Amino acid sequence: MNHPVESVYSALTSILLPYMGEPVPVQRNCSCCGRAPSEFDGVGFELVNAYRERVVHCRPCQTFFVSAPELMGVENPKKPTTGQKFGMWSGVGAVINVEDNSSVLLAPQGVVNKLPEHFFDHVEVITATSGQHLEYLFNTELKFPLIYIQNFGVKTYELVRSLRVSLSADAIYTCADQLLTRQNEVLYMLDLKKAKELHQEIKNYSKKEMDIFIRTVTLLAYSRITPEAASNEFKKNNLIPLLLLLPTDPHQRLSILHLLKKV
DNA sequence: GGAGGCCAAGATCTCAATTTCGTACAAGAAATCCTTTG
Ligand SMILES: [Zn+2]
């Protein structure tokens, strides 16, 4: 019940409620999310994947493998009878407001074209490419707690095991279909608050000074310029407060810079 | 007739550019020095 996949299912993937059929009583944990059957009420959906493996998917997890062409359009014309699947979308993200239980889908223009009219009635979709997810997140007033999926991808198991509720703008957890180990959440953690304050205070600096700051910090985070050189560049360009507002972590620096150069 | 395998197709996009070690030293003894000188 109170797990990350359940919220995204209720808010976003409940649109294909008609297109699964009834569950089946199961006696083994859902291989996709991995949690225990005790929170499935003893029911589950059996399935066999493209690799011929018997896998049990619970109610909110099985929705990532449902074929609903009459709702989700056709994903590949070579196979008309299998429409877009939530677990197979690559480049498509979403933002799910758990407390409101609503969802907004960030799909590129191609996917939006492939989606039928009936899809938009249940889920509001805004055309945005993979790089434009950050633009929507920055510009639009997010409502927390929320689940921000960045790349539905094709590795549905890793996607569901990477879902994490973003309790506030200080730490928005991106779910990019890559298994969110404790080693790599720095690459999937976005601090919209720090990026927002840095963007607010960057207005005081020239465009040339901006380019200089971004390039210097990027090179430093990639160890392509010595720290003394970067310090000289910051001091000569009066970029000290900007560095003071940057995280010490170089990967977070790169992430927030990537966000900055998108907005 | 079902059940393995081989292939094609699926959304657009991520940023960064590198150049050559260290310089000069030398103690009290069996030794062979020796063999003297002759
Ligand atoms: Zn599950």
Side-chain angles (χ1 to χ4, degrees), chain A residues 94-97 103-106 124-128 132-144 146 148 168-169 172 190-193 195-196 199-200 259 262-263:
Chain A
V95 170
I96 289 89
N97 306 9
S103 56
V104 53
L105 199 147
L106 290 147
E124 77 190 357
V125 189
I126 44 173
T127 303
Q132 280 172 326
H133 287 75
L134 303 170
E135 297 182 359
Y136 164 74
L137 290 170
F138 194 94
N139 300 330
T140 49
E141 195 278 326
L142 308 183
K143 183 165 284 307
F144 305 92
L146 65 92
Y148 164 58
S168 84
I172 284 162
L190 192 60
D191 48 345
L192 255 287
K193 166 158 55 46
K196 269 191 235 186
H199 201 60
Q200 265 108 43
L259 160 53
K262 291 280 188 191
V263 291

Side-chain angles (χ1 to χ4, degrees), chain A residues 5 30-35 40 56-58 60-62:
Chain A
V5 191
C30 164
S31 159
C32 155
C33 57
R35 70 186 73 100
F40 302 156
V56 283
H57 298 342
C58 49
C61 273
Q62 173 51 28

